[PDB]
């Protein structure tokens, strides 16, 4: 997050009388006076920009009120619960306060009402796979070994956009499942072809499962995408096992020839009733699974 | 008196350093996250917010079913035991916040505080050691590596239920299983260092490879 972070406080020692009430001074004056030692509790490695000069401004009013603004880039910790990934939403904190001065010495307030005291630029979004629904502003206390400190917090509420993972993982998995189910429509004597269907679809599902979690942390628990991939892999495995069961009951190694007439029960194999039932069962069960999955995962998060 | 942190540059402070440090810094936003607090009796409290990357040599023979001992080795650089004596203030309660750590891949079984004296050619120096025992979670690896290997090995047995004369189908099944195992091992390549010994996951994958290879040899 990139912020103009601006603080203000009254220093009675710095009152003055002159032609002009507010002295818009160089930022070098900031180092020559006391300023708050504000720091970000959950910050990881922040940058105070100093190109070309230190990106700060200090203004002293005649009554002793000081305004002090900085330009900062803070990369902060946002612990995530990825059980509902990619259908998950998060509330990333931004917590700041004095590092040295306890509540009995320094206290932080918001310049305006807390809702309006954090403003986001209209054009200021660099989120690719997230949407910033809004923010909530609050304050609290923290107890440490050194003392009690006021901690001013914001929480930015973000909702992941699902389109990337829909194109990356869900659609290839669905197409692999459909491709595996296509094998039910071939004649039972096409043993190498149906075996090719089964083995290639299992390979594709294994590759998709392996590469699905490339971008995530190595969390122990399973996610929604993990469950979806597991169910699709189960469907492909079941299709190949179904072909194996069909082939186990094939009596004759030759398929029907275009000229002969099959008697109704040289003889020929009949179309497998396993195949006939699978042609209806597998697509129907996959569709019902998709219905239940997308019904039970799309609407899970809190709403306003 | 909680003074501005720039007075630390004027005051004396211990020359503390972490021996197993690789890269570390004091946080510097909005200012240097440093604290100086003086007391009437001349007592000085000196606080710093430090992020440090510390070396931890990890034995991966039982990986991913392994536990690791990772330590931070606090020491005085220039002052021997005749000049400076370190101790853990508050005893075993000196280090706090370990219970709130929740790593995604590890669980902190326990932590230990040790105080000793380490001897070099230049003298004997005090040493404090903050050790953590970390136990690796297995669910991610079960999802990623073990279950696909088991499923491929199970699929390799389908050829036994196919007729001996269906050579194309049986050979395709065996070869595909071998290829998928090699692909799983490819993904195991892509996220580990070049250790010279076999791990537990390597043992499991080699066993599954031997099984699918033996199935193909059985058809042959």
């Amino acid at each position, epitope marked *: 997050i990139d912020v103009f972070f601006r603080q203000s406080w009254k220093d009675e020692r710095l009152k003055f009388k002159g032609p002009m009430t507010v002295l818009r001074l160089n930022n070098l004056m900031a180092s020559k006076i006391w300023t708050p030692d504000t720091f970000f509790h959950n910050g990881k490695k922040s940058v105070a920009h100093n190109m070309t000069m230190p990106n700060k401004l200090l203004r002293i009013t005649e009554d002793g009120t000081l305004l002090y603004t900085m330009r900062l880039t803070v990369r902060a910790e946002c*612990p995530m*619960h990825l059980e509902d990934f990619p259908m998950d939403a998060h*509330a990333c*904190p931004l917590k700041f306060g004095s590092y040295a001065y306890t509540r009995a010495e320094v206290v932080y307030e918001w310049t305006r009402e807390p809702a309006r005291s954090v403003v986001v630029a209209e054009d200021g979004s660099r989120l690719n796979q997230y949407d910033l629904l809004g923010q*909530t502003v609050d304050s609290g206390i*923290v107890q440490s070994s050194t003392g009690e400190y006021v901690v001013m917090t914001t929480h930015f*509420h973000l909702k992941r956009k699902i389109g990337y993972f829909v194109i990356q993982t869900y659609l290839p998995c669905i197409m692999t499942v459909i491709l595996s189910q296509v094998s039910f429509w071939l004649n039972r004597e096409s043993v190498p072809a149906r075996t090719v269907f089964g083995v290639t679809t299992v390979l594709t599902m294994t590759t998709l499962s392996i590469s699905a979690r490339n971008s995530l942390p190595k969390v122990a628990y399973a996610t929604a995408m993990d469950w979806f991939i597991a169910v699709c892999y189960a469907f492909v495995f079941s299709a190949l096992i179904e072909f194996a069961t069909v082939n186990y009951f094939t009596k004759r190694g030759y398929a029907w020839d275009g000229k002969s007439v099959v008697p109704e029960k040289k003889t020929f194999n009949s179309v497998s009733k396993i195949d006939r039932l699978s042609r209806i069962a597998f697509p129907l069960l996959f569709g019902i699974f998709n219905l239940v999955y997308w019904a039970t995962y799309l609407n899970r998060e*809190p709403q306003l | 008196l909680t003074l501005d942190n720039r007075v630390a540059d004027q005051l004396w402070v211990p020359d503390t350093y972490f021996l197993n440090d690789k890269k570390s810094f004091v946080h510097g936003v909005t200012v240097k996250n440093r604290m100086i607090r003086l007391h009437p009796d001349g007592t000085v409290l000196y606080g710093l917010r430090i992020t440090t990357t510390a070396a931890c040599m990890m034995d991966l023979r039982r990986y991913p079913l392994d536990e690791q001992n990772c330590t931070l080795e606090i020491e005085s650089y220039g002052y021997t035991t005749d000049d400076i004596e370190f101790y853990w203030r508050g005893g075993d309660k000196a280090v706090t916040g370990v*219970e709130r750590i929740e790593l995604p891949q590890f669980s902190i079984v326990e932590h230990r505080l040790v105080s000793r004296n380490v001897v070099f050619a230049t003298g004997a120096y005090p040493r404090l050691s903050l050790s953590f025992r970390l136990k690796r979670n297995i669910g991610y690896f079960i999802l990623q590596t073990y279950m696909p290997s088991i499923l491929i090995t199970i699929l390799s047995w389908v050829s036994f239920w196919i007729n001996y004369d269906a050579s194309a189908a049986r050979v395709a099944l065996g070869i595909t299983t071998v290829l998928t195992m090699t692909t799983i091992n490819t993904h195991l390549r892509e996220t580990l260092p070049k250790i010279p010994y076999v791990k537990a996951i390597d043992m499991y994958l080699m066993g599954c490879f031997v099984f699918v290879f033996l199935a193909l040899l059985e058809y042959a």
Partner: nanobody, 108 residues
Framework: GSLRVSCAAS????????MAWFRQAPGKEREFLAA???????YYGDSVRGRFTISRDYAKNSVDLQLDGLRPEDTAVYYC?????????????????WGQGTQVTVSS
């Protein structure tokens, strides 16, 4: 009078979650009392700021609330909640897990 109400969680570690206390009086809506974050940061409602104290034992996966300076209009059902505070930290809708509730009555 003084009191201390404890809440212990089981079946899920709430170390990374936020643990809060709510209060429902007879005939009124649930009111946020206090909450503690993973960073040991404490939030309080204005009605009970400076009186009630929230704490967390992370090893035992529990949250405690010390109530001091009780008065007759503190009588209510006190609820324990845990969740990730989405749009919230002060709204009951942001907490996914809730306790059964414990009655508290103050008699003058």
């Amino acid at each position: 009078g003084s009191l201390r109400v404890s809440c212990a969680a089981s079946g899920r570690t709430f170390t990374t979650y936020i643990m809060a206390w709510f209060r429902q009086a007879p005939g009124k809506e649930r009111e946020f009392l206090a909450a503690m974050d993973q960073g040991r940061i404490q939030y309080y409602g204005d009605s009970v700021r400076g009186r009630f104290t929230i704490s967390r034992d992370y090893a035992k996966n529990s949250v405690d609330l010390q109530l001091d300076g009780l008065r007759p209009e503190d009588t209510a059902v006190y609820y324990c909640a845990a969740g990730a505070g989405f749009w919230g930290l002060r709204t009951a809708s942001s907490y996914h897990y809730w306790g059964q509730g414990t009655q508290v009555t103050v008699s003058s």
